[PDB]
Amino acid sequence: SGTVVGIDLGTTYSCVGVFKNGRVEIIANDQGNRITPSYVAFTPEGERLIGDAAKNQLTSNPENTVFDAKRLIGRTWNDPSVQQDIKFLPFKVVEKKTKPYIQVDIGGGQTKTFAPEEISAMVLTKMKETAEAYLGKKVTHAVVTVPAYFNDAQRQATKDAGTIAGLNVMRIINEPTAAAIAYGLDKREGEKNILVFDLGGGTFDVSLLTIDNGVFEVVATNGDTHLGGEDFDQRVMEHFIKLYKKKTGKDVRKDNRAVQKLRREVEKAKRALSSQHQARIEIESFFEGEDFSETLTRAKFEELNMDLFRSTMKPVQKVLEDSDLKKSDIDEIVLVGGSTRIPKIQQLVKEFFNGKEPSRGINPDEAVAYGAAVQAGVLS
């Protein structure tokens, strides 16, 4: 096994960690980032790009930048989920052997068709190489996380992706369970009920876990597969674009370059508003050599997204019903994903459970990788 690594193979972002000196170390990639976009792309030239480099050229290559391969991985063509998601994806997806395949251009007008597994394998290879650089030796084995709702086919496909990347995926472990392990909830005594609330960039997952004698079980799952941090950005985008036209008289929509410059500052401001109450957004030479200068308040950000924020509670109530539990039967609450940093999200969860405090202490972007790395630590 050697040094086995824990890998959160996320829909939008992936994360890699290892256990050493009786603690978890989340490994930074060669650009110094602890998370790595699950992105693959090809340039006008032959060059293949994985991670940050792939996501940064998304704007200039909108139709041949692959992402969200995890939505397709291990599914059939006829699957209702696949047919829904291909309408939201810019790149072309096609049937081959009654399964979804991703068709992209390499360079010089040459096309190529990859299986979801191959895309995920490329991302895994990048996480593998990231880990190898930190450890200073080859990595052969890994613990990979998947959503709780994944079936056998999806679990096996994730293993296959590993195999292609040269990784022996020792264990497949459910994302909420990994998050629970990160917070040391497996050290708790007796029988307890655990609510995991996972709000990523483009996905929302609620899971009710039990723990019994330091061993978990996923009782019920729910959420929204197309609700995440990006939807909160889009409401902010829509607000400020409308404001710009109202003040200047200029419609910015058809200028792709300027719109990306705004999305960059909106994303920065959103993160800032998790700890501050206002954030200036200044862009010099924004559109037709005219500047942009507005402020986003926490109150406004909340106002623009209030309906979306409240909609997260319905899945929480539904999983409790399917688990045959009341609010008061929940002993632990675990918040995972960057969007859970938002104060309003935390308050809504807190208030739903009549003032009970969620667990804190772990980077919610990293919690799942953390847990996987602990399991890897055991198997090293």
Numbering used by the authors: 27 to 406
Task: Please give the exact wording used by the authors of the publication that reports this structure.
To better understand the details of the interaction between MANF and BiP, we co-crystallized BiP’s NBD in complex with the isolated SAP domain or with MANF. Charge complementarity between surface residues appears to play an important role in stabilizing the NBD–MANF complex. MANFE153 hydrogen bonds with BiPN200 and BiPT203, and MANFK138 bonds with BiPN239, contacts observed in both the NBD–SAP and the NBD–MANF structures. MANFR133 undergoes different interactions in the two structures, forming interchain bonds with BiPE217 and BiPD238 in the NBD–SAP crystal, and intrachain bonds with MANFD119 and MANFE136 in the BiP–MANF complex. MANFR23 is observed to engage BiPD355 and BiPD357 in a potentially stabilizing network of hydrogen bonds. Contacts between the SAPLIP domain and the NBD (observed crystallographically) do not measurably contribute to the affinity of the binary interaction with BiP in solution, suggesting that they may be dispensable. Therefore, whilst contacts between SAPLIP, SAP, and the NBD trap the otherwise flexible SAPLIP-SAP interdomain linker in a particular conformation, in solution the SAPLIP domain may disengage from SAP and the NBD, as suggested by the NMR studies. MANF contacts the opposite surface of the NBD; the cleft between subdomains Ia and IIa.
The ER-localized Hsp70 chaperone BiP plays an important role in protein-folding homeostasis. Like Hsp70s in other compartments, BiP does so by the reversible binding and release of unfolded client proteins, a tightly regulated process that depends on the concentration of active BiP and on the nucleotide bound to it. MANF’s SAP domain engages BiP in the ADP-bound state and disfavors nucleotide exchange, thus acting as an NEI to modulate BiP’s activity. Our studies suggest that MANF contributes to protein-folding homeostasis in the ER by antagonizing nucleotide exchange on BiP, thus stabilizing certain BiP–client interactions.
